[PDB]
Symmetry: C4
């Protein structure tokens, strides 16, 4: 009703529709049933991306803050940030050490 | 019967009801079917939080000890600690290096 | 048929029955339908433990080698090692730095 | 239809069939219904491997780049790389520090 299921690589992440609108002009804030990767039977959106890193991607919408995970390298996370349409420059002060280590 | 399902961000964590009572005056020790985010059909509680960090949150109840995860930054974990009503000061000696690094 | 489902904290881990026999005299090598936490309907064993760390616990049986995870502290992992009846002294050379850091 | 479910240790990872063909001559690029670990009822392939590390294994196919996870040791990951038929020498520049630390 007020929730959406984003099946990312098999893992069915779930959140309120309103949460996804918190960051406008991104792939998630743009979800629509006209999308081909939307299944009307299961009522979900399938994305062939890293399911582990997605919790971190989705946490940006939930908390309004961008943190970097520390179980994967910055480059892998940033690839995910680019696919989802998020900006890495928004990274929190606490996640600078894990952000600059790469460049 | 003696277990409860806490659907945190799509991930259905499961524990015994008694485990949640181990830390009184917290959001989890307060679960009730009167709550709106409780679904009588699936018989579960939905919370729009980081599903990965929750295992760590729930492990505090299971073991009676507060450890910090090391796959996310202290600040992100602490945000979760605040939502769940847990106190970070209870952090174990072994998790001080990951606790003070931030402040 | 030749597989068993160990529902650890909500997460249904699955392995071949033979894998669990690889380390005799442990809680997992001892699984039996006489156990109360065994559900004949779903055909699974429920354990109220850390679901994330379990993959590491189960990987000891699968690979025959004991590695320590690096997304949680040694103490938390060791608590799990004790519950499951595994011996930390078997830790691999590659996981000594994460093993001795604590003591 | 255009997707496949790889049940790795209980966790049902999902991807497009085409993604698996991106790295020829590997176990995943070779999946076939003639395989005994393929279940026609559930329509999936079961592999008794580390379910956590698999997201990293599968991310190599998705992104075309090999990164090492940092929540487990290099040796454990490499064991998985060998089972899946992937080559560790392809490791990205950003994941050298976590690759050479071991040898
Ligand atoms: Zn941070
Ligand atoms: Zn600790
Ligand atoms: Zn190791
Ligand atoms: Zn990398």
């Amino acid at each position: 009703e007020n929730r959406v299921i984003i099946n990312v690589g098999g893992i069915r992440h779930e959140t309120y529709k309103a949460t996804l609108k918190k960051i406008p002009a991104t792939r998630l804030s743009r979800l629509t049933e006209g999308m081909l990767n939307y299944d009307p039977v299961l009522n979900e959106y399938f994305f062939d991306r890293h399911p582990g890193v997605f919790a971190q991607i989705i946490n940006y919408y939930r908390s309004g803050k961008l943190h970097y995970p520390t179980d994967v390298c910055g480059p892998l996370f940033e690839e995910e940030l680019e696919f989802w349409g998020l900006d890495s420059n928004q990274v929190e002060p606490c996640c600078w050490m894990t952000y600059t280590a790469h460049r």
